């Protein structure tokens, strides 16, 4: 027995966002609402249907009707872009919670990815082992690819990749992983990660010295 | 109100999972006390809730297998279960519950989570690398490799170092296991001058690291 709410959410700045959280029935069941970052534990936004914690700003109302409640976010903002759940208790009756709803602000700003290419350090060499370092932040939206290359030729395996991830200054943060084995590392002129973003792609390069 | 939780991180299946967490004021028998999960894939979930009486109140698939101890004493309350299973992996909340109670049940006030694994897998302790930086700004990094399980905290000269700082999620590579790299960012011309240190810790090994970068 669950809450079914939608898994996404789209929104522009300033516009409003409603989110449907539903059972049945509902309203004569009392629906409060939940909100988490990424990385952190969610946080009370409604409690009671339409009442709100102290610490909540204006901008956040929910209401309660049939056999759906809801979730209003007038003026919707950057800082607001979590996961949100819902919660009853239905039906026999311990607690469960909703499904959870991706909320996303876009109509934001572009940006070019910082990338930078870190070569083995002297331990890892001096321990039969080396891993090239490239690391992607300050873009968006978060849409990347990687690439990796030894001298022109690009390199096939020994890869892994993380997943885009959110960061603090409301932007996106990636990484990726070259495995190598050091003879392939001091045996080459170059090594190189390039990161493709949109259309614009960024490279980088290091070199055994 | 602050809530703490402490346990381990790693747990082999069939055993008993053991969690507690710990409550400072409210004060005590103003709230129920309730444990939430969260499997890292996605979804919420909810498993029981005590009071300092000792009456509890368990989710009902999951009956005749938590159960929920407490300690009015030393301001704490406990959790076992069970025979844990491999699919019982997932980030683990103390939370509270208003007293009458309040039917119109709501958690207000949640711990920060602790993420227990469970697999026949063995723990291990991290390798960690400097990434070393050299050569307006330069940017310097720890990598932390090859670790198990998640998570792993990352702090720069005891916790110094808030500005310029990023710690990246891990990876699951071919291995099975973890590896995660943090990275600062940092005026060059200081560079020689000073001194960097990472300051890694992973608790279900016990162990804590602080390397130190110096330029090439």
């Known amino acids: 027995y669950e809450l079914t709410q939608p898994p996404s959410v789209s929104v522009s700045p300033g516009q409003t966002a409603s989110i449907t959280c539903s059972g049945d029935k509902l309203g004569d069941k009392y629906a409060c609402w939940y909100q988490q970052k990424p990385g952190q534990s969610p946080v009370l936004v409604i409690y009671q249907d339409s009442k709100r914690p102290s610490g909540i700003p204006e901008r956040f109302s929910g209401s309660n009707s049939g056999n759906t409640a809801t979730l209003t976010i007038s003026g919707t903002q950057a800082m607001d872009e979590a996961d949100y759940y819902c919660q009853a208790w239905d039906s026999f009756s311990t607690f469960v919670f909703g499904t959870g709803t991706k909320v996303t602000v876009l109509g934001q700003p572009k940006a070019a990815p910082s990338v930078t290419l870190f070569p083995p350090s002297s331990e890892e060499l001096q321990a039969n082992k080396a891993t090239l370092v490239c690391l992607i932040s300050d873009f968006y939206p978060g849409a990347v690819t990687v690439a990796w290359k030894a001298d022109s030729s690009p390199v096939k395996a020994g890869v892994e990749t993380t997943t885009p991830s959110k960061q603090s200054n409301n932007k996106y943060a990636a990484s990726s992983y070259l495995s190598l084995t050091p003879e392939q590392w001091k045996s080459h002129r170059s090594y190189s990660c390039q990161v493709t973003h949109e259309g614009s792609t960024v490279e980088k390069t290091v070199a055994p010295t | 109100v602050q809530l703490q939780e402490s346990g381990p991180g790693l747990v082999k299946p069939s055993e008993t999972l053991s969690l507690t967490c710990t409550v400072s004021?409210?004060?005590?028998?103003?709230?129920?006390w309730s444990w939430i999960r969260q499997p890292p894939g996605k979804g919420l979930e909810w498993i029981g809730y005590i009071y300092y009486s000792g009456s509890t109140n368990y989710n009902p698939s999951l009956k005749s297998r938590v159960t929920i101890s407490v300690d009015t004493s030393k301001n704490q309350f406990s959790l076992k279960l069970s025979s844990v299973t491999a699919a019982d992996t997932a980030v683990y909340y103390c939370?509270?519950?208003?007293?009458?109670?309040?039917?119109?049940?709501?958690?207000?006030?949640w711990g920060q989570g602790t993420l227990v694994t469970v697999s026949s897998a063995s723990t291990k302790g991290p390798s960690v690398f400097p990434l070393a930086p050299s050569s307006g700004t330069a940017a310097l990094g720890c990598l932390v490799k090859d670790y198990f399980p998640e998570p792993v905290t990352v702090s720069w000269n005891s916790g110094a170092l808030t500005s310029g700082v990023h710690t990246f999620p891990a990876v699951l590579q071919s291995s099975g296991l973890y590896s995660l790299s943090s990275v600062v960012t940092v005026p060059s011309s200081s560079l020689g001058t000073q001194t960097y240190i990472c300051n890694v810790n992973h608790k279900p090994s016990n162990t804590k690291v602080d390397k130190r970068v110096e330029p090439k």
């Open positions: 004021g409210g004060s005590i028998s103003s709230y129920y």
């Open positions: 939370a509270s519950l208003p007293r009458g109670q309040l039917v119109n049940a709501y958690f207000d006030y």
